[PDB]
Design a protein around this ligand. Structure first.
Ligand SMILES: CC(=O)N[C@@H]1[C@@H](O)[C@H](O)[C@@H](CO)O[C@@H]1O
Ligand SMILES: CC(=O)N[C@@H]1[C@@H](O)[C@H](O)[C@@H](CO)O[C@H]1O
Length: 285
């Protein structure tokens, strides 16, 4: 086994060379390795077919490594790959759309704390098996249509800490079985109704800290079975336009947060969840 690593077959075959100051992926990683650990090094690249001979690789960790570019090939024969953590590489900024193409059995994929500015075309094409998909704290500006379409088992989608400015119909389409997506700490101005139009089964949604003035009507409608909704820290305007949300909150059985009206004044500071129906004026004008 390569130096600066410990190798064992014990539970599953591991290579493990974490925090060993490695500058690049060592050449001698034994092929019949099941799980490989390379986080905490200084590996700045994942060149084409870096783990090819490891046909039985289940777990692979490269997080916290000053990654800069990950060859479109990279994970090529890692068909049995389950977890692939590339988190904490604020210098990556991007992943060639065809990168994860194979990765069928992929269960969990971490791409958080990465300079990801955009989510390319088929970045997540047919990742079917995927359930956990971490994408918090990147530079993502928008969620383009059908971006998570093929992700049918996805039950955990984290997108907070980005720069998403709005949620269009397209995004979150095939996301059936999605149990909880967080969108907090984003710049969400508008949430197109129907945007959650098959986002049922969803257990918990987060939209706090987001620059939302008021939510459309049919917006929270599909969220039958929702149990946790966090809407604090938003410029909630409270005029007749808030009725739909006001209403949706009253009939809500689950657990909500505080929806602080931050406008108009005179009502400013009060929480929409406790305003009486006729507190919302300034109608059709
Ligand atoms: C809860 C559910 O729908 N189970 C299926 C599972 O049978 C299948 O193996 C997987 C694909 O890897 O998709 C879904 O997770
Ligand atoms: C545990 C098991 O199924 N055995 C195979 C083994 O025959 C093969 O040599 C190896 C490739 O390195 O992949 C393993 O999965």
């Amino acid at each position: 086994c390569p130096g600066a690593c410990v190798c064992y077959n014990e539970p599953k075959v591991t290579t493990s060379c974490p925090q060993q100051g490695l500058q690049a992926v060592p050449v001698g990683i034994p092929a019949a390795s099941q799980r490989i650990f390379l986080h905490g090094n200084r590996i700045s690249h994942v060149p084409a077919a870096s783990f090819r001979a490891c046909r039985n690789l289940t777990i692979l960790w490269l997080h916290s490594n000053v990654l800069a570019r990950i060859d479109a090939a990279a994970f090529t024969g890692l068909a049995l790959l389950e977890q692939l953590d590339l988190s904490d590489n604020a210098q990556l900024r991007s992943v060639d759309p065809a990168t994860f193409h194979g990765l069928g059995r992929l269960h969990t994929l971490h791409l958080d704390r990465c300079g990801l500015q955009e989510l390319g075309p088929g970045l997540f094409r047919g990742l079917a098996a995927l359930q956990y998909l971490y994408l918090q704290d990147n530079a993502l500006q928008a969620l383009p249509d059908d971006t998570f379409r093929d992700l049918g088992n996805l039950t955990h989608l984290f997108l907070h800490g980005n720069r998403i400015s709005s949620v269009p119909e397209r995004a979150f389409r095939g996301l059936h079985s999605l149990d909880r997506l967080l969108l907090h700490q984003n710049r969400v101005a508008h949430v197109h109704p129907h945007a959650f139009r098959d986002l049922g089964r969803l257990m918990t949604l987060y939209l706090f800290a987001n620059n939302l003035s008021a939510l459309p009507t049919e917006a929270l409608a599909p969220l039958r079975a929702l149990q946790y909704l966090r809407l604090n820290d938003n410029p909630w305007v409270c005029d007749c336009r808030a009725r739909p949300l006001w209403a949706w909150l009253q009939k809500f059985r689950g657990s909500s947060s505080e929806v602080p009206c931050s406008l108009p004044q005179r009502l400013a500071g009060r929480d929409l969840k406790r305003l009486a129906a006729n507190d919302l004026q300034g109608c059709a004008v």
